[PDB]
């Protein structure tokens, strides 16, 4: 493989996969604080010229962390269809970016191509891709998984009612509930971040959601985002089970720093399906996002793009219901403003969608970065064509307790009823039946908590 | 007329033709959550988006107001800061946050204890108002339940653009057993007055994951009360010495 | 009327409706070069509130520029529907806002509603508007008209081939036209920007355009974008007329600068009328953009999205078959990076649906500007979703001529998969025809201009 | 194989995959410049397409900011002078200040330059530098022999730094000139950054001279028109208008 290429006469040389892979990243404020980056706007364009060209076994055979030191990196390569890598393991970076966009490569060829793959050479077709690629690419590669709700179906787009407390207050977090469904959120999951983690808690938030549900008889299930330990031990002792969510990062190291490994992941795997009150077989719930890698200190001189991929491997392992970046959650040291904001936004969903997992956003932003509420509906809005499975939902996307904000329950009727289209049928049911919505619209009594009393 | 940041306009119900307008007023109350704001279509009302962009003026503002030099001397503090030195410069490196400056370690090791078994340690973070307002409600209660029936006291000082991991130095520069971090969480739509507890047993920079500390947050007055929180830190710090673990190595 | 308002225990106090137009704006470069642009966020916040609480009224008998002064306010003024102001000169701007944005609001309310707005009010709405509204609002206020093609028909969207050369060389110019119907693009029109303002340069790149037109039956229109007084003798002259277009601008003054009198455009209609070979009833195209008033000195301390605003009242009096904004044609020193770009590209589009008019948009940028081709996929996909009646296209949107990046031949391609939109019928079934469409997506052979040969 | 984007192979790249006809694409893709007959991946562009793409934007947007040394300006014996505006930072921004002279500019005009001339030349190097080294020495000098020979009275010329095409109507009036010529570098393109731009009004006045006053002559570079041939017609041009002593749309024909 070429480490080298001339650009205007002009030879860049790149000292390994690893620097190839940095350096061809659009330009953000996370590469910089990494000392991966580019230095010009040349060497970029050089440095996916020589990306572009290398081949997928170039990428697979050299990850970011070693196999013998990094269990995420040995899951990634365990799940390989090797003889799905066989057909494209000469194929170059150019040629699977092309691959993935023509529309003469259907669904079935992509699900069967995709397991060939790793998570660096996912990055590495997200590097060369513009928005409009990781668009149309991401739109041509549905996931569709089941829970109680059908999720990922081309044609529905679906919401997390995000109903967080600062003080885990359940009448502050039925009173989120209820505005949520009154707009048709809630047929992704209906997740409560907590803010104290214990089993007594966690349960009394449970009870909380689960009220709600099992009085309306919602097809849909709660969640409460704690640690993966504090949730199994909760429906252990009988707390009704959904959705069992952890964070997860993309290397060992970052896992232990988030204290998690993967063998609570399978334990947590293991309870729902004796516990949890799902009627499909996909019960997990992970969360992801540029950066946790670095602010770990566990990114091993990668990019947080290419990071970021990583998770996706990681979490195609549990076949989980819902995945989705939280694209900026963090701060501007790792994305800066709405240019690059949106870029991760479509290269998150893309890497997800190319992975094979259930893939949605969290469209964010905070109030230390070079952005406004602007930018988080021209961002769902972008992804809701990429066929983004879901985004999040709170009362004009203040999030009281994380500081943060995110998209309005406003925001997913906008784009439902913008791009025709409709939640999960089993949800859109319920909505229809709750005289909420009709034909995919809300009705005019629609946005009105006050009608589930 | 109407200020958009009053409470009127905080308590404002939007709805057109609701089902029943005395649960909107109900629910609007039991949340500060912007509920209740009804809809144009599938967009929001004119006066909640007002509103919002109201707050969110005032949210961008709480980023880079600093805590003046002259309130931190009208309670006896150490002035130190980090490797950062302007608050430009401390939004975009967390890593010279998480370490202290030259001028810093000569300062620490000079007036402050040695070996002390909790350290109170107070920094800005990244919100001034989670600081000046909730300082004399949670400080000087404290201090007193750490003496009061408790063990060695470490000196309080005040770090300058600090980070969550600028502990683990301070951990083993002075030595503690148990160190307890004071610093301001990122500011909300709504407020920016939410203060974090950060406190790891024995901190080493080699070796202390993230998941080693436990985390006490959104300490304000809409959610933690300052007195309440302070008396369940001193509680919390008496059981890190106990069990000799934080974090997730932690039992109950 | 209220000129202001308590915020934060601060009072923001402000000259005159001028001056409230002006501080409403979002951020962007143009209103601060004026000197007329809010000088914080509170401020900003503060100028819409006052604004939002102003009544039709208000702002009707207060334009930027006074009726005896300058006939573009003659003409705004004297359009409008006397019946239709007076049932809404007292709803203040907030609830006209809602009222454009509510789903009980029909296409034909609005259709009665905006003959009693003038621009000013027009521009009042958009400034109260999110990126959302703009988007929301904007699809559900579709015009449709009809020249030899159909456009603005909901589920359509069209696009303009603009095959511009260095030297207007035939062959150049011929090139690009066969490229751009191989991905479909052309039912807006094959319009050309000439290097030379003269008559027989004008009839030599007509008949290059419809020999195309003529040898392939295409159901389209031609156009040379030159000053509208070299179009109207050339096509008395005995060149083929097709669409007939002027560049326009918000103020008497700022069509002074164009050199364009009221009388040319009535004349250009008449012009129409007798010779020009549409099949519809509607023949002319104006393009706009934010940024023009200001350069000519015009704008008499208006910003330039009220400005922008008058145009769109302007070309509604003379109903042209199409109008779009060139976003991003000039430079940074009106709009400076893609936030602006795009924000302005939604306003736009937005004020042009509100005024009735065919509205389109040319998504490009300059490359002094801090934007770049992903800046371009972004928002011809967001006003797409809005209904943005046509884009331009170019081969990889490089304009080797007028020095900018446009959208390209693929890019009109792409949203039409991506949404399942179509072109205008009548091209839709040319395309079918000549084997490049079917099912509104490129066939195996379509992208290869040698099928024409 | 190895390949540099910018180079001429990579420029004629035909990405056509099983064309009808494969030697028309080629017969194309030599009657333009445009970026014709490089393909598709579905509906989107070929990877290498968009590799050249972006490859020519790092290009374009160095020669925004690069500016003519102000050695090579006194190596053509020009008088240097500048608008309101100090640097190219500023230029961008600020339109208005470069359409004036500095307080020094207005004194330097009237100090060394002739004296209410017939023909005024006047150039700056506006949006593009390299449409003012690449095309100077080709295009000026036959202009300034053409006008003389045989002429009138001739202005001398001088280079206006960081000027917009306005800036003409102040030379105008301060020179008493009854033709302007303003050649000017327009906006960078993507492929090239060469092109020159020529603007001529008769007469200016600041306070009513419209923009529609002037005539444009437009992508005057190596890749458009030559600027030897282009000298030339803006000889006939300056000529035409002292005769019918008008500019832009107020002459005939
Ligand atoms: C952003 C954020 C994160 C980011 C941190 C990245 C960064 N900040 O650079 C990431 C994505 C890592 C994250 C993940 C997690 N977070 Co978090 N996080 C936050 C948040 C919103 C902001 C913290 C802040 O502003 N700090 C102030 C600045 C100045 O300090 P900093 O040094 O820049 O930030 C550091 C710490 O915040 C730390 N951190 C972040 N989250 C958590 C959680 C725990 C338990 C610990 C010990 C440390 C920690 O990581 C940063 C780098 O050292 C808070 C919410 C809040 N209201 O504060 C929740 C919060 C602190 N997180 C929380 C949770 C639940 C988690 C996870 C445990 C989720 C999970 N199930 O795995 C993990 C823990 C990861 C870890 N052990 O570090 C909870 C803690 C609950 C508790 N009882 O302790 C909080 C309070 C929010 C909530 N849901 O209630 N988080
Ligand atoms: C941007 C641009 C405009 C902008 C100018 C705003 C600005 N630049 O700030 C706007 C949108 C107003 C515009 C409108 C028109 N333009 Co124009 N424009 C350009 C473009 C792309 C750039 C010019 C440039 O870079 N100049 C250099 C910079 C440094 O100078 P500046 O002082 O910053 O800008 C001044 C000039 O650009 C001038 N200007 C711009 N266009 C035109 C056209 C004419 C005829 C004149 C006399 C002056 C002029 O206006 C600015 C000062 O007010 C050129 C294309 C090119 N290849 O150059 C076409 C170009 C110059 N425009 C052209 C045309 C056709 C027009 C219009 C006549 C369209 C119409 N049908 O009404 C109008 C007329 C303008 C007028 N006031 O008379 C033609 C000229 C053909 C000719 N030989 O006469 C060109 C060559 C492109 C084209 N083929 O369409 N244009
Ligand atoms: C309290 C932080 C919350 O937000 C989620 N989160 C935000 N950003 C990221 C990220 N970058 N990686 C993983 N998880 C993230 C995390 O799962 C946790 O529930
Ligand atoms: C040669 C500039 C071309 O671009 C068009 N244009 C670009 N920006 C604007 C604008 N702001 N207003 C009106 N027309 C514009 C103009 O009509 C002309 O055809
Ligand atoms: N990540
Ligand atoms: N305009």
Known sequence: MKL?????????????????????????????????????????????????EMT?????????????????????????????????????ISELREYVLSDETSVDDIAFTRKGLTSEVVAAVAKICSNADLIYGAKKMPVIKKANTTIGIPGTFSARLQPNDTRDDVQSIAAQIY??????????????????????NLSRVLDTIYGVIDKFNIPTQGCVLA???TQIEAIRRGAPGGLIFQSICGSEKGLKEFGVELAMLDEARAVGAEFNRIAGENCLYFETGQGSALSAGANFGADQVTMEARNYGLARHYDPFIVNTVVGFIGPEYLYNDRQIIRAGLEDHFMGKLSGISMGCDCCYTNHADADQNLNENLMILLATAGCNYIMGMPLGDDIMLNYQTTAFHDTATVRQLLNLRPSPEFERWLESMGIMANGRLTKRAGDPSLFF | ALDLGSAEAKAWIGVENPHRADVLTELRRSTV???????????PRTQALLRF?????????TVLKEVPEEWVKAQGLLEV????????????????????????????????????????????????????????????????????????????????????????QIGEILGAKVVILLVGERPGLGQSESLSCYAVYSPRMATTVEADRTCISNIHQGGTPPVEAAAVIVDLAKRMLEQKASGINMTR
Chains 1, 3 share one sequence.
């Open chain 2, 33 to 43: 959550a912007r509920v209740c704001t009804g809809r144009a279509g599938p967009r």
């Open chain 2, 81 to 168: 800061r980090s490797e950062i030195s302007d608050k430009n410069l401390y939004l975009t490196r967390p890593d010279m946050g998480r370490r202290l400056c030259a001028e810093a370690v000569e300062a620490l090791k000079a007036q402050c204890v040695a070996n002390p078994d909790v350290q109170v340690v107070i920094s800005d973070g990244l919100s001034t108002d989670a600081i000046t307002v909730n300082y004399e409600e949670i400080l000087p209660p404290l201090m007193a339940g750490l003496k009061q029936a408790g063990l060695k006291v470490g000196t309080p000082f005040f770090v300058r653009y600090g980070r969550v991991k600028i502990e683990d």
């Open chain 1, 179 to 200: 505005e949520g469904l009154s707009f048709g959120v809630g047929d992704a999951v209906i997740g409560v971040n907590p803010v104290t983690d214990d089993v007594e």
């Open chain 1, 227 to 229: 640690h993966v330990t």
């Open chain 1, 4 to 52: 080298k290429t001339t650009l205007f006469g002009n030879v860049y040389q790149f000292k390994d996969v690893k620097e190839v892979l940095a350096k061809a990243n659009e330009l953000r404020s996370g590469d910089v604080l990494a000392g991966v980056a580019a230095a010009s706007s040349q060497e970029r364009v050089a440095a996916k010229q020589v990306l572009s």
């Open chain 1, 56 to 92: 997928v076994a170039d990428i697979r055979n050299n990850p970011v962390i070693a196999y013998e030191d990094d269990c995420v990196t040995r899951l990634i390569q365990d799940d390989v269809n090797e003889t799905a890598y066989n057909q494209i393991k000469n194929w170059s």
């Open chain 2, 53 to 61: 962009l109201a707050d969110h003026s005032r949210s961008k503002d």
